[model samples]
Target: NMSLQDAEWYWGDISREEVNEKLRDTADGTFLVRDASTKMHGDYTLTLRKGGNNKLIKIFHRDGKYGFSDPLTFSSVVELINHYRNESLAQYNPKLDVKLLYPVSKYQQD
Candidate 1:
């Protein structure tokens, strides 16, 4: 099983550019990225874990604090992205302000 600390371990020593590349190259397994400005500053991190039959998404806030979304069982990468985008938008509030790395609104035709 994967824990928040496990996500931290996976993110350790990885750069933002490398993370972007990993997302582009793989559709499964764990992936982490910090806020674009901070880029691994340790204050804010987003971790996504996609397994054969399960998906986990969580945000690591400052000083070991974290928040997790309910379990997600997305069928494909696009669906996963859409879910994140929509949920983030609906839940947008002052307390939780972590901007998504890829917002579907940005890609959709207007």
Candidate 2:
């Protein structure tokens, strides 16, 4: 019953340092999706906290569809996050071989 933009973990245009701090106190699988700082609209970022480190993985927007693995497109960034929430993300980044078990909710501090 939730839309992508309304998703608690979708931190639109959040700074990298902000994300770093947000995930710092969370568990390894905690993560958030944010608008890419550079491309503006062509991409998004899956900022994850894993193994005491922050991993920012690129999520590409392809002709309206979005994906972490270029060819494996999804309907929306929200769906992409949902799909990976319970699945292993090792295909995208072996170093970040983790699932999105916990989302760093936007309202946590708001």
Candidate 3:
């Protein structure tokens, strides 16, 4: 989920620093894009449904403007980049840029 700003139910109480710290503590060395915003709709709800791997990253981005991602990996990162790129092209606002990188063995899923 890890929605960017401008999302509904965004829990403004949670700052980007806190999010980064939590991710570092749990999903250290793993690639993550936090607070990635979009204009697909208004009042979006983004939340982390699972972690580690093989989990759902749910996003309730507005009404009928939500989506999820598979386990985090290079391929997934590429997908994210493409998805967000298109979103940026359409929305005319760049939220976050995604890039691919090799996953460490320990971080690999079973």
Candidate 4:
């Protein structure tokens, strides 16, 4: 359990293990990129969560435009996150919902 970290956004706190679960579920081939912090000093994290399960298996590319992988590895994930975080990249908007972007076919209308 976690205390309320941000009431304004109403974003509930989650444990690391919970995040891992979300990543693991993302095995269906989906990913998420969220702005970890709004300040320039803050670090941005790229969360790789499987689609169907939405489990957090790995993370990478804390704050940059070059860290998307097919089979994200633990070492790669950690490296990217640490590197970008140290670089101090600015907050990126329009966080991606990987599934929505990488679909089987864009022409196929739902």
Quick one: best TM-score, which candidate? 2
lDDT of 1: 0.38
lDDT of each: 0.38, 0.84, 0.32, 0.35
Model 1 misplaced stretches (Cα beyond 4 Å): 1-3, 25-31, 34-41, 47-64, 67-89, 93-110
Q: Which residue pairs collide in model 2, if any?
A: none
lDDT of 2 by residue, 1-110 (tens): 66878899998988998888888877888899888988855799998887788888889887889888769579888889988987889868675579989987787564
Compared to the true structure, candidate 2 yields what TM-score?
Answer: 0.88
RMSD of 2: 2.1
lDDT of 3 by residue, 43-74 (tens): 22222212442221333343333444222222
**What TM-score would each prediction reach against the true structure?**
0.32, 0.88, 0.24, 0.26
- Over 1-105, each residue of candidate 1 has an lDDT whose tens digit, in order, gives 433333232344445565555455433433453443343523334444333222223343433333343332443333344445446523534444332343211
Candidates sorted on lDDT, descending: 2, 1, 4, 3
Which stretches in model 4 have alpha-carbon errors above 4 Å? 1-15, 33-40, 50-110
Compared with the true structure, the alpha-carbon lDDT of candidate 2 equals 0.84
Per-residue lDDT, model 4, residue 98, is: 32
How high a TM-score does candidate 4 get? 0.26
RMSD of each: 13.0, 2.1, 12.5, 13.8
